[PDB]
Amino acid sequence: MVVLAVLLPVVFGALLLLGLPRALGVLGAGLSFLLNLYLFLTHPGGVAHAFQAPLLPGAGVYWAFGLDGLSALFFLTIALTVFLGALVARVEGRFLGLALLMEGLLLGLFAARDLLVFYVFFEAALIPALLMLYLYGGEGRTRALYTFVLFTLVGSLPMLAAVLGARLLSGSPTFLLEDLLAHPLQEEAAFWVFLGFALAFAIKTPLFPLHAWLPPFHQENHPSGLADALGTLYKVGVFAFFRFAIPLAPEGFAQAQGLLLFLAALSALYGAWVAFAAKDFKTLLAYAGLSHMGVAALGVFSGTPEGAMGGLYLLAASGVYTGGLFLLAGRLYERTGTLEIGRYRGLAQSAPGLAALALILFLAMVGLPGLSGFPGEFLTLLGAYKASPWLAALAFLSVIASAAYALTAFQKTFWEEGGSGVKDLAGAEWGFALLSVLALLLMGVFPGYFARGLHPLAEAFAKLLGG
């Protein structure tokens, strides 16, 4: 059942940290991958395997779990990405444990069927992230850490008032999501609570003015970018919005919608555009992530089930291809020793199939049809265009800037005249590669099958904004 799939990477990570050796946590992430996939296939529906247990009975906090049409793949996606992180890896700190921990944590995050437990996981995921940051490398480790951590925390602590306000002002008996939705908040109560959800959710999305933490985080982790790959699976803001923020207090979102769509747009454009100027992989992938999130959020904010489904989908898959690009970047680090874009040009003749792998990944990134990005990007386009067309448009001078940065990077890294020559592919990197390509191709070619669970949620919570 659900809780097992939730817990599996968590235990394996501990067994990696204190435990020996490094190798086992790899198949740990693999096992998580397989089970999460197993729950993905055989799903009955919204309930799946339901879980309820007392936590603070008197407070009204209970352990509440299950797989939605949403929670779903996100187990598969996260399990996957983190698995690649485990295998291809090479951080191998014995903090691949810190990674498996972080994976499991995120799994618990998506499965939360009640608000306060969700809150709990939401705050908990911070620690390995800061650790695999801090003690697992970087010179500017401590300041980047205070940046990432304090942004998240300053965002977070006030939300507890809203999560209290959501329960307390609505007179909801418990923190159970069902219950909370069953008692809607009124005008200028739902306002404040939605706002309090909206700050913590916006800063973790990220949207335009609040993204300033993202480039420093990804730079200073262990260069393979296991910590980074898991950091991107931590970008969960959109999911939190659609699942929690909007449905618990939609009346406020009705007011905020214009601004949110705008910010999503400007995040997308600015993100892809600024990404161009980036001189290193960490920064580049950061701004790119910002653009994608812009798109997703744009999709969600429009109402319009089309756009929303596009947003959540784009999120799910971009976790995978972004995390993949991170691990890949680290793997070329270990063989070279540098994350710089300009130096060490020749690769493509020197590297037999990497050009193909990295290319596949980047194609998935720019949102080319047949790969994971396009379905989400497109459906998003549709919905964004439905609510505010202009913001869909501004947001969609994205594809231009996106192809720009992605192709510039790919060319200057791979295509040109020979250097010394490079190591071909690692045995971990092969599993990484093939599995990656499989994921990207399958989510790209059959956007129907994945995201079918997204479809009921999409239109229902869109009509939630209706009469």
Partner: protein, 605 residues
């Protein structure tokens, strides 16, 4: 399901040659590729002759995966797979001793599969899969020899400028979702019959579809991307400029014949842009001192011709030109390609000349080609060209200003073709070549291309001579009409096209023989060689400024981060002001104490 096979074979093959392919002997990736392409054409023509085909499949909700194979789709499919196959075999020839044979033919199969995906679509997002896909495979082939810096950036520019168009395409596609909600071309057309609704928005959607088309068919302003596509191996340039790619620019309009046939403004503009593209491409054509580029400008010009056709509501005519052109352009490019396999890629004009006697059988090829492009009175390019010239006058949207212009453009398209052939094959000698020149598997299909060139021809002949093509094209899709036609004067018109073209070819023969090239014209040769200085202007307020704005916004973002640090320090500071509040003197603590307490008791009321 059988319909999907056509697409599947040169993917399965592509996948063999990309994945393995280097595991194959030097002929074999070419043999596989050309083999899978061979029965794609074949095994899809089986479908076409059997009356039609349909496919519908699971995809994004509301947008199923729908392939419709009808007359309009079949015509394109036969062109693409046939000429494409010829180019596959030719590529078996011209690619030799070059590593990544695998890579090449993988890319080739892949390309074929993608185009088949594009033209067979009953839904616009499937069509879009086609679009972005074909753009991608172009990118991939153009950079095939990657060790060169110049042929890298080419493809980058391609896919960027092109993605501007794809963005238009996406936008227009989103426009017709909010509107109708189908996005399947058949039901989207059946939904567009009758009164319509909100005409401004429809015109916008079609206009963005066109903004895409401009990119894909290399019209103005996005014209600029095509000339640099010379970089890739010549049969790649053959595939792009003739049998694939730009043609889809026209095809998108042709399937959308239903959409544009109700849009007078947009169609007027389409014809305008077609005319300007033709004229531009033709004027700047001859000044070119390179053999490849000088042909590429004829590509641009002739596609301009087609867009002029599809502009005034003559869709089948635009497709006629597409057909004839598909023959004679492929002929030209494969010719020129053969030429520089002989000089070891010397690929120059002023460094060339006087190849007539020394080159057997090639002279015939390039001559047939340049004459068809010139629109020689009995040859394909002729029939297509005045099919268009007449369609100008006869069809709606008026063609009066357009006719004369297009006729002058016919003069120039004659002239530059002749400069090409003259400067290449005549006028003394420069350089070096020794024994073999043409191998068997190049000129053998190139011959067939010359054949098709001459006889594409009479498939549509002005009306008493049978119009075989028009009925084929009109019913299945390309639906709506409203045209007058006239006679006795009309053969006068055909006579005019013939006479004017004939005059133009010879004027071209002498001038571009000349040697005086007198006065202003040399400046004209500079400007035409430099493409009338467009790119310099695109990096003026467009490219370099956007590039700089990336940086500007970057530094802005950096500064943002720094300001946040500013807040951190503000809280720190405030904090130590509060920590400065404690001096350490007891009397200080006592006074601060009583102070605080009075503050509280004050608060209590």
């Amino acid at each position: 399901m059988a319909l999907l096979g056509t697409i599947l074979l040169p993917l399965l093959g592509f996948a063999l040659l990309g994945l393995f392919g280097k595991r194959m002997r030097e002929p074999l990736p070419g043999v596989l590729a050309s083999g899978l392409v061979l029965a794609s054409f074949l095994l899809g023509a089986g479908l076409l002759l059997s009356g039609g085909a349909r496919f519908q499949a699971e995809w994004l909700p509301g947008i199923p995966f729908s392939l419709l194979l009808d007359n309009l789709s079949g015509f394109m499919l036969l062109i693409v797979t046939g000429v494409g196959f010829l180019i596959h075999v030719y590529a078996i020839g011209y690619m030799g001793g070059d590593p990544g044979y695998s890579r090449f033919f993988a890319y080739f199969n892949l390309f074929i599969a993608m185009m088949l995906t594009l033209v067979l679509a009953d839904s616009y997002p499937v069509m879009f899969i086609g679009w972005e896909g074909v753009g991608l495979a172009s990118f991939l082939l153009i950079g095939f020899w990657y060790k060169n810096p110049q042929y890298a950036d080419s493809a980058r520019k391609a896919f960027i400028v092109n993605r501007i168009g794809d963005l238009g395409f996406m936008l227009g596609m989103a426009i017709l979702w909010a509107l109708y909600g189908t996005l399947s071309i058949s039901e989207l057309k059946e939904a567009m019959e009758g009164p319509l609704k909100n005409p401004d928005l429809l015109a916008l959607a079609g206009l963005l579809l066109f903004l895409g088309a401009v990119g894909k068919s290399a019209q103005i302003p996005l014209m600029v991307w095509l000339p640099d596509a010379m970089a890739g191996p010549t049969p790649v340039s053959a595939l792009i400029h003739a049998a694939t790619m730009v043609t889809a620019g026209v095809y998108l309009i042709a399937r959308s014949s239903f959409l544009y046939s109700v849009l007078p403004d947009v169609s007027y503009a389409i014809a305008v842009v077609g005319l300007l593209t033709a004229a531009y491409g033709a004027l700047s054509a001859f000044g070119q001192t390179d053999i490849k580029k000088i042909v590429a400008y004829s590509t641009i010009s002739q596609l301009g011709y087609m867009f002029l056709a599809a502009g005034v509501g003559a869709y089948w005519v635009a497709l006629f030109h597409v057909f004839t052109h598909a023959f004679f352009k492929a002929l030209l490019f494969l010719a020129s390609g053969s030429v520089i396999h002989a000089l070891g890629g010397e690929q120059d004009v002023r460094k060339m000349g006087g190849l007539w006697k020394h080159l057997p059988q090639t002279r015939w090829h390039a001559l047939i080609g340049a004459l068809a492009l010139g629109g020689l009175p009995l040859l394909s390019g002729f029939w297509s060209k005045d099919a268009i010239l007449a369609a100008t006058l006869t069809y709606p949207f008026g063609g009066v200003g357009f006719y004369v212009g297009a006729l002058l453009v016919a003069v120039l398209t004659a002239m530059y073709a002749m400069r090409w052939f003259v400067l290449v094959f005549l006028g003394e000698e420069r350089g070096h070549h020794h024994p073999h020149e043409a191998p068997p598997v190049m000129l053998w299909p190139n011959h067939l291309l010359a054949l098709g060139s001459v006889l594409a021809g009479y498939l549509a002949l002005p009306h008493p001579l049978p119009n075989v093509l028009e009925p084929f094209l009109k019913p299945a899709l390309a639906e709506v009409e409203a045209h007058h036609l006239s006679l006795g004067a009309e053969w006068g018109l055909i006579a005019l096209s013939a006479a004017v073209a004939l005059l133009g070819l010879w004027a071209g023969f002498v001038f571009f023989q000349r040697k005086v090239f007198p006065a202003w014209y040399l400046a004209f040769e500079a400007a035409s060689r430099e493409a009338f200085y467009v790119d310099r202007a695109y990096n003026a307020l467009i490219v370099n400024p956007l590039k700089a704005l990336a940086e500007a916004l970057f530094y802005g973002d950096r500064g943002l981060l720094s300001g946040y640090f500013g807040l951190g320090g503000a809280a720190r500071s405030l904090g130590q002001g509060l920590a400065r509040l404690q001096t350490g003197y007891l009397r200080v603590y006592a006074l601060l104490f009583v102070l605080g307490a009075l503050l509280l008791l004050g608060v209590m009321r």
